[PDB]
Every structure is written in C-alpha cells, then in structure tokens.
Design a binder for this molecule. Structure first.
Ligand code: NI
Ligand code: NI
Lengths: 271, 271
C-alpha cells in the first residue's frame, strides 16, 4: 500500500539517493518513479514531511530536510530499522536519557502525587510478580485485567516454536509493565512533558524491552528496582531516590552492554 | 481541504462529542457525517490515529484513544488552540521542563563538545545583538545569513500596521535564535533525545516565544543568559552552570507570569 511509498522515500534519503541537502523531484516524476497513485503520493508525501523528513511550501518545491533538524522522538525507532550498526548508539541514548531525567520527574511524582505514585508502582510490581510466577504466559494473560491492552501491545502469537514464543511473550509483557511504570510516574510528576517524552519514545522502548527483558536477570533487577522505588516513596527518604536510580541505571546498562553482543535477527526490523 | 476533517474529528473529541472512551462511528457514516471523500477520510483519519488520537486495528472498529496516553509532544501545541484557559498550564510545563533538563544536556555539551557549544552560543549572541541594534527588522534580515530559514519560520509579513508588524517580527526572530541555542546545545550534549525533545516541542516553543520575546526585558534577560552560558563553557566553571540556569529559569518565569495576564488575541489560534 502507501507503506511502499513512505518506506521507499524514507530509505532513499538514508542510502544517498536524495541527500538531506538535495531537492526532491517533481510531483509527477515521483508519482511515476516507483508507480504510486497521484493523490496518495500527495497525501503521504505530505505526511512524510510532517514527520520532519521534508519541507513543502507553496510555489517553491519540496526539499529534503536536514538530518534530525526537525523530526521528533519517533524518528529514533525508524532509524533502528535502517543501518543495524547505529542501533546500539540509539539504545545508549535511550537508557542514558531515562536514567538522567528519572530523578527529576520521580521526585516530583513522590512529592505531589505520593498516593498515585504508590498505587502505580504497586500495580506494576503485582503484575510483574504474577507474570514471573505463572505456569505459562497464557495462564497469566487469561487472568489479567490488562489482557486486551497487553494483546494490543504484545502482538506476537504467531511463532511456531512454542518455547521461544513463551520467552518472547514473557519479555514483551514485562516490558509492558516497565514502560507503564516509567511513563505513568512521568505523568504523575505534574509536568505532562515527561510522560509525553515516553509516549514519543514508546516504539523504540518496546523494541528494546522485547529483547532486554528476555533475560531473567533483567527482570529480577527491574523488580528489585520497583520495590526500591516503592520504599523510597513510602518512606519519604528523598536523598535515596537519585542513588537508587543511579545504581539501576548502571547495572541495567551493564546487562544491556553484554546482551548487545547477541542482538536477535529481528531486532532491526522494518515494522 | 483535509484540514476541515482532521480539525473536526480532533475538536469533536475535546467538546465531548466523541469522548476518549467512546467508539468512533462507521467508515461510511463518518465520511457522510460532514461530507468528506471516502479515501481522504481513510487516509487522514488513519493519520489522526498516528498522532495518538485513535486506535485502528483490522476487523475491530476504530476507538478514540485516552487523553494523552499515546500522543507525543506535538499534542501540546494542538491543545493550545483548544480551550484558551489551559494554555498557561502548558506554558508552565514547557518552561519548567526546559529549566529542569538544561543543566544536564548543557553540562554534557560543555564537557564533550566545548568548541561546538561555544560556536553555537557565539552565533546566537551575535545574531541577537545585531537584531537588537538594527534600525529595522527588514534591515537585519536583508543582511542576515539566516534570512531564508528565518523567513520560513517568521512568516508574518502580512500585518498592515507596520509598527506592530515590527514588534511581532523582532519577537519571532529573537525566538528563532533562542530556540536555536537551546535545541543546538541539546544536540551538542551527545544524546540525540534532548535535541529531539526540543524538535517535538518546536511549534509550542515558537508560539510562546512570539509573544514572550515581544517584551524588551525578556530579550535583554535572554541575552545576559547567553553571555553567562558562554562564560561558563569558556571558563570550565562547572558548578556555575546549574545556578545560572536556575536564576534564568526563575526570572524568565516571573516575566511570563506577568505577561500571562495580557495574552494576545491570536495566542490560542487554530494554525
Ligand atoms: Ni504542571
Ligand atoms: Ni550518545
């Protein structure tokens, strides 16, 4: 469908066919270039510029935008699918950014939204511990109030190898609750921009977590981290919050630094 | 054009016509509801869900997404155009977030990209001082290497009142360089996520600055701030960076807190 057009124009800016300083060709020459309907080319080439790839103003032609000068956070996940060997750098940026800003929005959340923060952390802890103790993923999800949302986000029930299907589904479900924790606390901070940051980063977040949380050590470390966050909020021990986060940022990074050596085949996937 | 459709569906989620928990009606019933072509309804109602307003999966219907659960930073500027009396809260979120994360990405930029940071700040300072000393805005822009980009971003040469045209253009140009400073330093941090944060916030940023920087005190305060940032980077006095930023975050906020009382008519505008 239109995905052929969008992914073609996007990929042809990454392989030097239409560099970020070049002009994009005519309307009809592009609609003719790889065989796309006129009006669909109009209405997805327009929205390929709303993502920050292009700049189209009336009269003057359409011009390819510079690298990362206009695009938002979404671009990162797109850049994961192109050129495998910069994905690691993107993941370092994600982990480092989350570790950097978590003490701010979490101290705000613990101060102004103590009870809501505690309820969120308790829900995440209970769901993660129920999933880790379940006999299978189908058993946890059959009895989970988050079943439908998880199924929206954990769309993988297609693998024919049932054991690896189990591992992948456990990882994606745990990542569902990890994201829920960070994003919801970000909104609990009282500043919507932090939550919106995670919202913009969600696709990259889930791609990273679907592999990262396939390691049992990652899940146990995250679980200890959640319990520590809950204890910090409940006790009002403010000075403990940056230390906890700091430690968790380090150790998790180390785990990633090892798992990075064996990235799965699918990890850099065009959707 | 399609803007009628997109702004109608978006506005009808804000005035309780299709609440964030309701279902959206049929394809043909909506394409018939306010008179939009079938396929254009398909291809902008689809992309009104890529902005996070809807969720459309095959077989199951399209469902209105919850308030701010999926949408990215862009949503903020959209929310400025709806319901005037929450715009102030959005601006508080923006100023507070920038003040919060600026010490992090600026200390990173000063440490790992000292020379690039200094070049960026010097360019911003020189452009701002040249604009503030110019006999008119047309004189500054006629002799500015940033002329075309500014004209892309400072599209206002339509006002018939020339004096107020001058004030508005000076404000928008100064905001052009203020944004350039914060965003470019954010990218200089070495973590692309900070720069991408500003990129996602750019529309709200420019809307806010086009009024905020119409006050001469705002421009002078920002200029002193830029000089202080340059001195901090050049001297390697790390401990001064959070203090400087902190002070600037306070005073600017105070200025906004006063100017907030007389928001211009256009401030909450549907494009
Ligand atoms: Ni707030
Ligand atoms: Ni980096």
């Amino acid at each position: 469908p239109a995905g052929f057009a969008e992914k073609y124009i996007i990929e042809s800016i990454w392989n030097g066919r239409f560099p970020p300083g070049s002009i994009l060709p005519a309307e009809r020459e592009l609609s003719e270039l790889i065989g796309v309907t006129r009006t669909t080319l109009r209405e997805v080439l327009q929205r390929l510029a709303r993502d920050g790839w292009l700049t189209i103003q009336h009269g003057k032609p359409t011009k390819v935008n510079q690298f990362m000068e206009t695009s938002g956070l979404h671009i990162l996940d797109t850049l994961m699918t192109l050129d495998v060997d910069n994905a690691t750098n993107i993941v370092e940026d994600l982990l480092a950014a989350r570790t950097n800003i978590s003490p701010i929005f979490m101290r705000y959340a613990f101060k102004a939204n103590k009870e809501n923060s505690e309820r969120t952390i308790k829900n995440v802890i209970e769901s993660c511990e129920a999933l880790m103790n379940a006999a299978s993923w189908d058993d946890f999800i059959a009895s989970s109030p988050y079943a439908e949302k998880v199924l929206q986000n954990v769309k993988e029930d297609n693998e024919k190898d049932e054991a690896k299907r189990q591992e992948i589904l456990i990882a994606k479900t745990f990542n569902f609750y990890d994201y829920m924790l960070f994003q919801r606390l970000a909104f609990h901070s009282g500043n919507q921009i932090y939550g919106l940051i995670f919202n913009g980063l969600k696709k990259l977040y889930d791609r990273v977590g679907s592999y990262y949380f396939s390691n049992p050590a990652s899940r146990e470390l995250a679980l200890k981290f959640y319990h520590q966050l809950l204890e910090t909020c409940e006790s009002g021990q403010r000075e403990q919050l940056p230390v906890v986060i700091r430690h968790y940022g380090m150790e998790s990074a180390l785990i990633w630094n090892e798992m990075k050596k064996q990235l799965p085949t699918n990890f850099t996937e065009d959707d």
